[PDB]
Design a protein around this ligand. Sequence first.
Ligand SMILES: C[N+](C)(C)CCOP(=O)(O)OCCC(F)(F)C(F)(F)C(F)(F)C(F)(F)C(F)(F)C(F)(F)F
Ligand SMILES: C[N+](C)(C)CCOP(=O)(O)OCCC(F)(F)C(F)(F)C(F)(F)C(F)(F)C(F)(F)C(F)(F)F
Ligand SMILES: C[N+](C)(C)CCOP(=O)(O)OCCC(F)(F)C(F)(F)C(F)(F)C(F)(F)C(F)(F)C(F)(F)F
Ligand SMILES: C[N+](C)(C)CCOP(=O)(O)OCCC(F)(F)C(F)(F)C(F)(F)C(F)(F)C(F)(F)C(F)(F)F
Ligand SMILES: C[N+](C)(C)CCOP(=O)(O)OCCC(F)(F)C(F)(F)C(F)(F)C(F)(F)C(F)(F)C(F)(F)F
Ligand SMILES: CCCCCC
Ligand SMILES: CCCCCC
Ligand SMILES: CCCCCC
Ligand SMILES: CCCCCC
Ligand SMILES: CCCCCC
Ligand SMILES: CCCCCC
Ligand SMILES: CCCCCC
Ligand SMILES: CCCCCC
Ligand SMILES: CCCCCC
Ligand SMILES: CCCCCC
Ligand SMILES: CCCCCC
Ligand SMILES: CCCCCC
Ligand SMILES: CCCCCC
Ligand SMILES: CCCCCC
Ligand SMILES: CCCCCC
Lengths: 310, 310, 310, 310, 310
Amino acid sequence: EPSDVFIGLKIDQITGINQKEENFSVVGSLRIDWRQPLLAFEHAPGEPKHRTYTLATFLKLLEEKQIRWPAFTYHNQQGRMDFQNRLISLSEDGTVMYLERFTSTFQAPAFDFRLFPFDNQLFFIHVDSIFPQHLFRFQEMQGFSGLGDQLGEEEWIVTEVNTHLTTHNEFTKGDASRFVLEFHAERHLNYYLMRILIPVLLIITVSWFTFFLQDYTKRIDLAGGNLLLFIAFNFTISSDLPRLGYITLMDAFLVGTFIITALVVLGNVWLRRLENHGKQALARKLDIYAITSYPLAYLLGALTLWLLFF
Amino acid sequence: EPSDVFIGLKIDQITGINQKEENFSVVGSLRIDWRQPLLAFEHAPGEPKHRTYTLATFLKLLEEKQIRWPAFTYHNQQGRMDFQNRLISLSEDGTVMYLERFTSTFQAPAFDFRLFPFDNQLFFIHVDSIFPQHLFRFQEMQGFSGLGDQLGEEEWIVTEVNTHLTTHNEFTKGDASRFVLEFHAERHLNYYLMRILIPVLLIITVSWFTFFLQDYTKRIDLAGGNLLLFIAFNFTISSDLPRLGYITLMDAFLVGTFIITALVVLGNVWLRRLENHGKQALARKLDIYAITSYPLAYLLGALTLWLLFF
Amino acid sequence: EPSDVFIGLKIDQITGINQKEENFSVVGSLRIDWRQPLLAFEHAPGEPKHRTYTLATFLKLLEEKQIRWPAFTYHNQQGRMDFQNRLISLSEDGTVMYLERFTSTFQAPAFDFRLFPFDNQLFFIHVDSIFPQHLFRFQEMQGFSGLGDQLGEEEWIVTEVNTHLTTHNEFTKGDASRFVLEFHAERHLNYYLMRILIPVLLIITVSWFTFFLQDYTKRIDLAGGNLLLFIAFNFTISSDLPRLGYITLMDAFLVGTFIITALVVLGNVWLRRLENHGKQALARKLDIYAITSYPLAYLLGALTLWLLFF
Amino acid sequence: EPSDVFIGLKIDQITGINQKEENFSVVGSLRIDWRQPLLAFEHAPGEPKHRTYTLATFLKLLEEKQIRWPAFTYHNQQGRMDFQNRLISLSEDGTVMYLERFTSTFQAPAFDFRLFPFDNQLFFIHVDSIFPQHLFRFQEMQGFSGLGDQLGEEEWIVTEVNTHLTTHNEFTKGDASRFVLEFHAERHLNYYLMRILIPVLLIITVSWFTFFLQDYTKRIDLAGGNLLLFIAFNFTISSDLPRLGYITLMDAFLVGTFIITALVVLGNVWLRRLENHGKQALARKLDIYAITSYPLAYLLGALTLWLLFF
Amino acid sequence: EPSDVFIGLKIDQITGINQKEENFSVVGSLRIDWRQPLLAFEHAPGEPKHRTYTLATFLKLLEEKQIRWPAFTYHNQQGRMDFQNRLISLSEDGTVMYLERFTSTFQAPAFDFRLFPFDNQLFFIHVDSIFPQHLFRFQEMQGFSGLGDQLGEEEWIVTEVNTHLTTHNEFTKGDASRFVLEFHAERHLNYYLMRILIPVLLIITVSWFTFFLQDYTKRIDLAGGNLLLFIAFNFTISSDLPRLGYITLMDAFLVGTFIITALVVLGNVWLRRLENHGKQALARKLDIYAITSYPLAYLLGALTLWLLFF
Ligand SMILES: C[N+](C)(C)CCOP(=O)(O)OCCC(F)(F)C(F)(F)C(F)(F)C(F)(F)C(F)(F)C(F)(F)F
Ligand SMILES: C[N+](C)(C)CCOP(=O)(O)OCCC(F)(F)C(F)(F)C(F)(F)C(F)(F)C(F)(F)C(F)(F)F
Ligand SMILES: C[N+](C)(C)CCOP(=O)(O)OCCC(F)(F)C(F)(F)C(F)(F)C(F)(F)C(F)(F)C(F)(F)F
Ligand SMILES: C[N+](C)(C)CCOP(=O)(O)OCCC(F)(F)C(F)(F)C(F)(F)C(F)(F)C(F)(F)C(F)(F)F
Ligand SMILES: C[N+](C)(C)CCOP(=O)(O)OCCC(F)(F)C(F)(F)C(F)(F)C(F)(F)C(F)(F)C(F)(F)F
Ligand SMILES: CCCCCC
Ligand SMILES: CCCCCC
Ligand SMILES: CCCCCC
Ligand SMILES: CCCCCC
Ligand SMILES: CCCCCC
Ligand SMILES: CCCCCC
Ligand SMILES: CCCCCC
Ligand SMILES: CCCCCC
Ligand SMILES: CCCCCC
Ligand SMILES: CCCCCC
Ligand SMILES: CCCCCC
Ligand SMILES: CCCCCC
Ligand SMILES: CCCCCC
Ligand SMILES: CCCCCC
Ligand SMILES: CCCCCC
């Protein structure tokens, strides 16, 4: 009959989230309890009731006694894992207690940036058993798994945490146990509000303020400068995300500004051409409509973006 | 007679592709099966039918029994390889099973950027045997080799995967076995369409829109600004590729814009000089041709680029 | 009865403080004294009164004698720790002396940027015992703990240093000892004064100097350029801090400049519109008020910022 | 009498050349053959005629037999060297065969940038014996040393490869053997032609095109803008090279453009001052000379640079 | 009585100097000679007169014989040290010879940037003995210490090198030996002359050239542009140094230019205001003084900077 293995995992720190590379790094602790009757012993007088071992000596003892150990792996681990503590404790009845402290990076293949920056994401860590379920079975340790209090993350806010068990067939035809830890997070909007939304609205407001001078050439020149400013803003924004194959809300928002600036340039050019041919009265008649059509275009664009994306 | 060695390799993650340095990094697993009759044993009562070893103990046992092992290497490996699991399993008949999990970077010397960004590339991993074929022979393990489902790559799309066997003579006069895994990939165009093509066309469209004002000096000034804008665009684009010895489609596309801007400047200067000498009627007569010659030049340039490159 | 463990920690160098990632790196030394009567020995003639061991041999000796050692860990350690010296000295009465030299990075979750750049911060290092207090108890070594003289930090100035003891329940239901070292630091203002405050004031002063020309259009153009300059300054400043969820004094200072520039643009546009309709006398009458209202707005904004934040 | 040591070294990949730091990184293989009669043995029946060892076991065997080994070092190695394979093979007559695969970075102190970008450089790798020549002597292995075919370098082209032997006195009064591998390389000019030469010539051509409008103020403004453009180009160029103590051809080329722009500004200012005083006829008379003196200055500057540097 | 330990240290390469982080990295070699009569032996026939050991075997032998070894450390070492060779040689009389090759980074807390870029700096490496002087004493090995010939540094020039001995009390109440190696270096000025001094002087010269047009508004506009250019130059310069708490010569030089530009703007505004009120004769009378006061201000500023700093 297969033997039971109890698994527990806790996350202490979140050292960083890299959305450009779609990965994250944490500092955590692992606890495992496993009982093997063949490791039972009787303590001599003057000796402690529990024995302490290093990992190498414990492995050598297991090899000498020819006992199979439950090898496992981190399925979505990336790069090198730095170990701080690896301790072994053995009781008289054969129960083995193991502790592991580490820092490592893990893959996050569930990213979706369609609703950026109003998006919510999922992160997980998978622990897989190598041997099939007819030799070892995973069980959930009680009272240890979860997330810490001083995570240190400034931008992301955790919403929920869950754990469960499942199976896999990575290396054997038969099923093997898998342990899963998951959590969800969302984003703060203060940085985006302070750095992106306000400057664009201020530039648009000043450009519309300048329209009361009734200077078509000056309007054309200002719109031409604002087009380059918007292009620079788009190029700056594009550097924070991977080269995705789909269009996002921010990109649509910038393209709308591009289109509106182009339309304003065309209208001002037409008004100047009308003025140049002695139709100043017609230009003055159409100027009120030209001025009043400016904010409604942006309002309609915002409404259209909301309808399309939400 | 030589002994048979079965080889299998699977790729789980693609952590990144660096076209500037022409290399890529993956996370994969290696499986090898090899049978040696001299390692046969009989299990004692109460002991498992299979024995588990660490790598060092297995190597020490092989050295004590004086048995040659099939050493191999990754031919195109670059840098340090980080190992996560290295496990050994031995059966009673002498069959050895080996598992290896790693993360590493590999060279990609087959890059070709002539059709960038409409290019398709090839990637491969080579496994080479050190000893000649009269001692060991490689064989293909069935049902293990291939690529995973959750690769995590956002820009590249895999098209096909193949494996085969060949030979090499790196260290011996005689032939030695080689195992090859290959795949092809292409590129998404959404990022390029959103970031490069649209702004240039919009700038050209606005510059041609401004031509209806009939202001030669303003046309000259706008063209002069657009030349600097195009130079900045070219400098920004050049940073994503190595310093190649051949010209690409994007570079030709930018040079065409340079040439067209220069021609527009020359034409506007000639028109202004004609106007300054009392030939305003001649300038107005030629203005229609000057305006109508603008988009045909770009159309002819696009056609010429298509003819030259495709 | 539990045995006493004496702990001492000293910091020699501060190699860097990364406020963007909220961590710091140091070079330090650790000293521990622990007495075990079971390790007593008698020296043979011709041999020294003290014995020197490497860490591995000492651990092997402890395992052979089956003696539990007081395992510990750095709670807020991040990444890999590089060890330079790990020495063991044993006396005849069983007293063990241990020395450890290392370089490592530690988490700083107590950062607060609300008063930046007039802020004061706290840094700490935690040492935790794994076994509960009924087996081992931590004690404070005298005359060793503190900070060095040649720290090498150029921007931060240390104000005070303290040490104390506390408890934790990370791995056991019972309490376990904890050792804490803390210090506070503040910031130099010369860099900020030379790089930020002076250029903005100079630009504002030159913009107000230009007001005596009585040219509304030139004022509008200069204000439009200064708005872009201020936007560039804000974008440059934002890169030195994490994407915080709250507003800081520098951000408020930049937003005030944005608002004042917008108001100046609006006022100049209104004056130009008044002049265009034959109300030049009214514009000249209001010009004195328009000129005199410029510095009072900045003075009131500075006063309001001081009231809000201090 | 000293024993002979045969040395061979081959380079498989060139992973990068860093001219800013003056170093390069490669992937290579090392082969050594050495015969020691004290290691002779007789094979038992059923055992192979050659024995395979790991490095640690071979070193332990040598220490047990008390045999000195020929220690060596890479003289110009920088940083850590990553080893992939380290294999030992021993024959019955005592001949030892060694293989080593590595990736590492090496110093390049022979750089000279005076003729940049028309320069040719030298690279080398030095292998030094620690013990003097009265104990060991190096010999050249035949048929192994050289460079591979798939180097992967895109910018540099190899011209020749050579090997030889010499001596050194790094650690002993007597001479010790040294093995040297050298090669030369030159640079591709397509990148420089496409990115540097064409834009500058186009800007100069457009600036000279604008001279036919007969507008001194516009000429002054255009020259003032081009001066800033050239300054930006110089600052961009300077980042690709170390802070050298001597002047290069590119720097002289940029300084010539600076000087010519300054002279053009001075001439245009003088012409405008002449026009302002009623000397428009004199200004028109001198305008032909002013226009015709523009390209001859650049031609003379190019000739002078060629004379000075070549 | 204490035993004598001979120490020698040589530096082969200088791989880089980081003034922003105030550290430097080198490649060097260490040689130590120490005699212990308890390690004497007699060679058997057929064996060499000297024995070769690895570090681990030598340490195990010392532990078996229970002999204290002179442990040492690099006091100002930062980060991980990469070892290439660690060799042990023992003679029949008990003399031990040790060799160590390494690459590492060291702290430089003696930096002073007040006279930048005309500054001269000091660098040192400290080797400290752990045990007090009543057990071991350091001595200076003759003919080994110093610096190499092919250092590879391009910007810094070494002026002198010295060695000496001193004491410390880092870990014991009694004194312990210390070995010190020091050298001084200065900076090349070609890079600064070519990149900083020339462009600023050229811009100032062109701005003063433009003054002969007698256009106050154009002077104001040019000065306004040059102010932004100088601000950009200051921001670019500030990135090469740490955020120091004191003002440097370059910063004072840039602030002087700021002040002079502001004064020029004020003077031009006053002249324009005088002209606008029918005082063109007064403006023309004061124009000669305004023109002649330009270079004397810069000359006086340079003299004042020289007086203040030198
Ligand atoms: C770190 N990875 C595991 C990802 C890579 C492999 O690491 P190694 O191959 O170096 O070591 C394997 C360690 C081990 F698995 F053998 C073991 F000792 F930890 C144990 F599992 F056997 C155990 F006994 F400790 C226990 F935890 F299962 C028990 F019994 F305590 F519950
Ligand atoms: C990681 N590289 C290989 C690139 C560098 C060298 O690595 P090492 O020299 O450290 O170890 C060599 C390991 C090994 F080759 F000896 C072996 F143990 F893995 C084995 F091949 F012999 C085997 F027995 F395991 C097996 F796989 F062939 C079998 F029999 F199971 F099929
Ligand atoms: C480096 N971390 C500790 C963070 C990770 C674990 O490191 P390791 O598990 O590799 O080694 C554990 C070392 C040790 F703890 F066993 C010990 F030898 F240092 C000792 F504590 F037992 C001691 F005896 F030295 C002493 F200091 F307590 C005494 F007695 F001298 F006071
Ligand atoms: C990697 N560096 C060498 C730069 C640093 C030192 O490396 P290590 O000190 O760790 O190992 C030393 C290895 C060695 F030198 F002892 C040896 F085993 F390789 C051998 F030279 F003795 C040999 F026997 F293999 C042989 F090659 F000379 C022969 F006989 F085969 F020809
Ligand atoms: C690298 N650091 C030293 C910075 C960290 C510690 O390194 P380790 O603790 O790993 O090794 C300690 C090495 C050593 F010190 F024991 C020794 F073997 F090198 C020796 F000093 F004893 C000696 F014998 F070699 C000798 F040099 F003194 C002599 F006798 F030859 F002169
Ligand atoms: C409140 C934050 C909004 C951000 C829109 C880009
Ligand atoms: C077409 C979308 C425009 C959005 C502007 C807020
Ligand atoms: C809740 C998000 C609304 C976004 C509107 C563009
Ligand atoms: C559809 C993508 C086209 C990109 C051309 C540069
Ligand atoms: C000469 C090529 C021009 C291409 C413009 C689209
Ligand atoms: C299919 C690619 C077409 C490119 C035309 C320039
Ligand atoms: C004295 C320094 C003040 C900095 C204000 C931003
Ligand atoms: C509203 C705050 C303005 C601050 C300007 C100094
Ligand atoms: C002491 C800090 C004052 C800040 C005023 C804005
Ligand atoms: C043909 C390349 C010339 C480069 C001159 C800078
Ligand atoms: C004085 C050198 C000028 C070179 C211009 C091509
Ligand atoms: C062959 C190089 C010529 C360079 C002329 C400036
Ligand atoms: C000769 C170099 C002078 C540098 C002044 C900044
Ligand atoms: C006040 C210092 C000015 C220096 C200009 C060279
Ligand atoms: C010798 C340095 C002189 C510097 C004058 C500003």
